[PDB]
Amino acid sequence: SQELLKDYIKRQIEYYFSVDNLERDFFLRRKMDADGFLPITLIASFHRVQALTTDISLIFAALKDSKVVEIVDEKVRRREEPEKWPLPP
Numbered sequence: 001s002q003e004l005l006k007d008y009i010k011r012q013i014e015y016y017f018s019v020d021n022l023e024r025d026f027f028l029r030r031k032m033d034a035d036g037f038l039p040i041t042l043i044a045s046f047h048r049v050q051a052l053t054t055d056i057s058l059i060f061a062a063l064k065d066s067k068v069v070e071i072v073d074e075k076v077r078r079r080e081e082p083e084k085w086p087l088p089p
Contacts, residue, residue, distance in 0.1 A: 002058055005058065008052055012048050013049065013063060013069065014068045016043065017077075022078070029085050029086055031089075032086040034086055035086075037072065037076065037082075038075060038076055040056070040071070041056070044059050070082075
């Protein structure tokens with residue numbers, strides 16, 4: 001089973017995309033495209049996600065379970081007003 005693991009991964013990534021985090025997370029914001037999207041494999045590299053798993057299908061399945069984020073292809077963004085967050089690299 002991976003259901004509980006998927007829940008821990010979902011809540012960890014939803015933290016990165018919370019307003020509280022985004023107001024100070026200048027690294028993540030400089031890795032966004034102008035539409036807010038980031039590579040899912042960049043999120044996978046973050047220490048608290050990588051501690052839980054290196055299984056990319058599990059990470060995608062965790063994110064399909066989220067009302068906070070939106071996946072398109074290989075990228076993920078905050079669903080609400082994502083264009084407000086990108087910063088210059």
